[PDB]
């Protein structure tokens, strides 16, 4: 009895160490770049994560001709969740708030990389009601190259996301008349 209980424990602890060493080294990140060619100041940068986190802050504002660079990532240690979230700014020159969403999941058998962006009315913090509205109810974009979309109020965007899981998301927000990039 007891000799094989300790030997079966030493085997089981070896398997649990392999499981947690795998889940701690399966990495997800979404290097978000949002470029403001709008002709308008963006301010009051707010953030929500359905899963994952980031180590730096958003810029408080991004002025005309500058970019938000943001580096969100999965929760540290042996946890099987991806990086999924929303980023938002008020745009006081038009009275609307931009929100940008990304999903970079853990389990690519069930899910895939998605992103979206929209303008909401007034000043709003990013929260779960923006995540579900940007991910389900307004048609999101796959990680299959460049897409282009009007925002109303005289703005549009063009953007893309890579399919990697160590993803890049890249968006240019523009006057509607402007040629992308």
Ligand X SMILES: CCCCCCCCCCCCC/C=C/[C@@H](O)[C@H](COP(=O)(O)OCC[N+](C)(C)C)NC(=O)CCCCCCCCCCCCCCCCC
Nearest to residue 180, comparing CAs of 134, 145, 132, 138?
A: 145
- The option from a second copy, ligand X, none interacting with 71 (CB < 5 to 8 A, set by class) reads none
Q: Give the residue, chosen from 69, 79, 94, 138, that forms a contact with ligand X under the rule CB under 6 A.
A: 79
Q: Does 77 bind a second copy (CB under 8 A)?
A: yes
CA 80/CA 111 separation, integer angstroms: 13
Nearest to residue 47, comparing CAs of 136, 170, 130, 160?
A: 130
Q: Give the residue, chosen from 45, 74, 106, 115, that forms a contact with a second copy under the rule CB under 8 A.
A: 45
Supply the minimum distance, in Å, between the C-beta of residue 164 and a second copy. 4
Is the four-CA dihedral 132, 34, 178, 37 of positive or negative sign? Answer: positive
Q: Does 12 bind ligand X (CB under 6 A)?
A: no
Kindly state the tokens that stand for 105.
């999941």
**In the complex, which residues of this chain contact a second copy (CB under 8 A)?**
2-4, 6-11, 13-15, 17-18, 26, 43-49, 53-61, 76-77, 88, 125-126, 144-146, 148, 158, 160-168, 170, 172, 180-181
């Amino acid at each position: 009895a007891a000799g094989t209980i300790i030997a079966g424990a030493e085997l089981t602890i070896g398997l649990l160490q392999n499981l947690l060493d795998v889940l701690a080294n399966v990495n997800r990140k979404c290097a978000v770049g949002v470029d403001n060619e709008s002709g308008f100041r963006w301010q009051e940068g707010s953030t929500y994560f359905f899963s994952g986190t980031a180590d730096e802050n958003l810029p408080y504002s991004v002025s005309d001709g500058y970019a938000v660079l943001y580096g969100p990532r999965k929760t540290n240690g042996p946890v099987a969740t991806g990086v999924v979230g929303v980023l938002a700014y008020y745009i006081p020159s038009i009275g609307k708030t931009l929100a940008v969403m990304w999903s970079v999941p853990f389990d690519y058998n069930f899910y895939q990389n998605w992103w979206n962006a929209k303008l909401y009315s007034g000043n709003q913090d990013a929260d779960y009601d923006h995540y579900v509205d940007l991910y389900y109810d307004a048609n999101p974009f796959k990680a299959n190259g460049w897409h282009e979309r009007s925002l109303g109020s005289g703005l549009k965007f063009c953007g893309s996301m890579s399919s990697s899981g160590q993803a890049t998301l890249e968006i240019h927000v523009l006057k509607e008349s402007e040629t992308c990039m």
